[model samples]
Target chain A: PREEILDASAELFTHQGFATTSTHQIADAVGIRQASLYYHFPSKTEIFLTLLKSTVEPSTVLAEDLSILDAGPEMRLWAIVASEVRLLLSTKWNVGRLYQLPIVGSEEFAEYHSQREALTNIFRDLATEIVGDDPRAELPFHITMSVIEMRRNDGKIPSPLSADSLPETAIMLADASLAVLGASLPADRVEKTLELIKQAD
Target chain B: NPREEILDASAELFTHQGFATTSTHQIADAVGIRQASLYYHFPSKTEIFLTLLKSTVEPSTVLAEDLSILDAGPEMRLWAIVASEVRLLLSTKWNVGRLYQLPIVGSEEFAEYHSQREALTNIFRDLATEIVGDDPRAELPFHITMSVIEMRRNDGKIPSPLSADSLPETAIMLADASLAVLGASLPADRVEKTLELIKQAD
Candidate 1:
């Protein structure tokens, strides 16, 4: 029931602004009365926080276990890019774009802000290692993530190309990330690494 | 007085909250006018929105027309489009480009806006296809390049500074980065041709 409520809340929040979405709407979408909804969660803030945690924290957990430093720069960079791309592409509802909204960026959501900060620090650590003293280190990661944001929210203006599906979306994302890092992808190597990371889950 | 006040407040609100979520009542209050009085100035919220979209998309539409006959090689033409976009995005202080990122840009009310935007995108798509071949990844560069415009509004220091006059370097860097994303998948001859064109065209 908690999972169901959170899922409904995420969809409503993505489609509508958080301030504009009422608690009753989420409850109704979850097929529960408002009273039942309160039993599982205290308020809209809790529902939003829980959803934010699930959407973002898993990537933090994945980053913690990644043997990123052990691999050479290109492979390590590819790992970071592929892992994030796979996580986003595999997510339901494509809810990743929601975190960018002004509603989430509010001071009230301090914890949500910190969790993102932590994940970014991890990326910064890996990115700086890949290209020493390079200013555009974050460019590739920024581009891939924004590309997914556009992909997720693409309902209004559709992409001309149909969804090429995952890992294909994943590969193109990885290639763009590599391009900014000044590396060309070795196709076979990236595929093996992509599969291995998913299995590591 | 009311028209300017309403559009100014609405653009500010629209930048932060977006079109769908921002209400006319809020716009009225922000501009110190009554909600009913606001309707006299703009017939509907969609009207204010269309006016705002016109302010942003119309310039790029003009640039698209100019580029249709730009006398440079395809590579320089691509650079010109990006450099012009960076300048346009920075000059507007990013309020205009935020509309592009907003999901509401896809709404039926903004069909003309979308059509104009598509005209701008087709320019990138054709240039990218020519530079990188008709491979599916060609589409990736167009998205990645345009993503920079949205990044300015992100308020995070993803990269680059927001101050327009601070550096011509920022725009050039953006143009180079955009070209690099496209050129990464290109054939050797195409890459050499692009680099030479960029040098010669300068």
Candidate 2:
């Protein structure tokens, strides 16, 4: 019963927001009587959370995977940023919509949120490790987040990528972001990166 | 499991590349699958992509909820206010959408994002209301609140790039700096209310 409902929910969750879907619509989509659906999921929100949970719980590992990138530190951070964008561009659910949703609206939704904050806070702490008390430490939090936001904008109804070279684009954006904070990519890194992309091309 | 692999691949491609530029071929290569297998895991590219975002939305909102902590004084509250939108600890959509939703009169992103933003803003503005008192802080306080909000909301117009990741922190600085300027030019109470908000979370 749950799997069938979740599949339908997963399919529909991308179309309209979690808030707009109704129990009756979900039940009908799953070929269940309304009463039976009610018996299974107390509310559409419960079903939404079910999907959100399965989706985020595993995805939390993105942060863990990012944590291991401590070797080159800055380079590692760039990889993490690029990796996050790669994932978002292919998703059904709007990560921004997910983040943009208001928690003060629902208790169940709010509870689901805590699991992620734990990861981001960890990511931030981990960031401190990579950045080593650099002035950009805290500011990069917004930039990393901005990278996520900027990648999501898509420009028009359908989306557009800022460039053909996304990995390089991500790197340049990070460099720009750092520059915005009055820092730029180190000289050697820029020369090497240009050489790398040019060669890869 | 194959589906997970595909989604992981897609997530990676989308992360570096962004949505439109990522192609099925790239996703397949990343996942070690053929293009058709993407359809096998899910109907279309859109489905795979939806799976990625659905994963993070609620979690972002949860982190955003922390800014509601009222005891932190005006500046702290102000920091939290801007931080709510600027902090990357959540997702870009979380921060951007929060700002993107503002009632910026004639902004391009405003209509697309207003409803959700207005709702979150209602919560934030309530903090403004708490500090400014029932009276209009000289002006309606909406303009003051919203114009200052442009640190993130009014992106193109902001003269130069704002304080980087210091977005939330930076907003307060610019805001305080503006208030300090307004403190001299505006009426005493208007400036004072701005000052009141600054101490709040500024």
Candidate 3:
């Protein structure tokens, strides 16, 4: 029931503005009473926060595990980028849009912000290892986040990379991240990185 | 007293709260003026938003023209333009780029703003195409350059204290990364030369 509520809320929050999305509307979408919805999430903000966290929490965990893996920074970074792009593309709802909700900037959601920062730092640290403290070290994470904007753009305009090409698109972004960091891996290294990512999954 | 003051306050509210939820009264409150007075300068909230959106992109659009006419190589021109665009975005009083994320701006009412933004993207596409002819990644540089919007959004939420030099440094890094993303990484000397051109163009 909690999962159902979140799924419905994700659709509402993304399709409609967050501030305009009411708990009553979410409950209606989920086919539940307003009180029953409250039983699962104390408030609409909590539901929104949970949905926002869903977008990054898995990648953060993967990044942490990949950080400790006995692999080169290039392969590990590739795996991280690939995995994050895959996650963002594969999500049912465009939950990445949730990150842009105005309420997200409020003090009420500092926890989500900090968690996101931790994810950003993980990307930065791995990037720093490969690029050696260059400011471009931050580009990989930003590049990965661009997947969200890409998806958003797809809605606005016709894109050559469709939903069916998500995996391919993910690889393209991962390779782009490597290129951005000046750590272009050979084909064999890329295959090995894919194997690492698949094994982690 | 200044019309620019109202735009600045509107940008802060709209960026932080949102366009749909922020009312003219609130914008007036932020600027310490009556809502009626606010209307004296701008007739509606949408107009204020449209003006703010234009301010964010207009400079880059002009810079793109200046870059196109420069005698520098495509790679150098690309780097200068990306760095300048990023700097323009980061230097806004508020993260005015956040206003681009607003769903309301996607409506037919803001067609003018979208057309102007599209012109900037077209410039990015032309430069990117020059660097990597017929490559599928031609559009990647434009998308990568615009990711500065996301960076600014994150900075606003977390209050990361970017150092004085960090802003321009970050912009240069993005420019380098944009080239690298297209498999055309620039050398240090070329990058230095590009920065000089960017200054001279200014």
lDDT of 1 by residue, B1-202 (tens): 7697688788778777777678899999988878889988998888998898888788776765666465556666676666666655665533556666565665687888889888888887787677778766656545655655544653322234334234344455566667777763323343333334334433
Q: For candidate 2, lDDT tens digit of each residue in B1-202?
A: 7876676666555543445456788888877777786777787666665555445333334433545554455434543444333333222321222322211212443342334444454555565555555532312222223332223432222222323232344434333322221221223233233335334443
Q: What is the lDDT of residue A164 in candidate 1?
A: 27
Name the best candidate (by lDDT).
3
Query: Model 2: per-residue lDDT, tens digit, A9-66?
Result: 7555444445456778888887889999888888877777776665445435555554
Off by over 4 Å in 2: A1-19, A27-42, A54-59, A66-70, A104-106, A130-136, A147-201, B1-169, B172-202
| DockQ-sorted candidate list, best first | 3, 1, 2
Against the correct fold, how does model 2 do in TM-score?
A: 0.40
Model 1 local distance difference test score: 0.67
lDDT over C-alpha atoms for residue B73 of model 1? 61
The runs of at least 3 residues in candidate 1 whose Cα sits more than 4 Å from the true structure, single-residue gaps closed, are A149-166, A184-188, A195-200, B1-5, B20-40, B153-167, B184-202
Q: Per-prediction TM-score, please? A: 0.80, 0.40, 0.85
- Of the two candidates 1 and 3, the one with more favorable TM-score, higher being better, is 3
In order, the first chain's TM-score in every candidate is 0.83, 0.56, 0.86
Candidate 3, residues B1-202: lDDT per residue as tens digits? 5898998888888887898799999988988989888888999998898888888777778888888778768888888788777777776667887888776777898888888888888888888899889876777878887887776653333333333333465677778788888878586675566556656654
Clashing pairs in 1: none
Candidate 1 CAPRI assessment class: acceptable
**Against the true structure, whose TM-score is highest?**
3
Model 3 lDDT, residue A82, Cα: 77
CAPRI-style docking class of model 3 based on DockQ:
medium
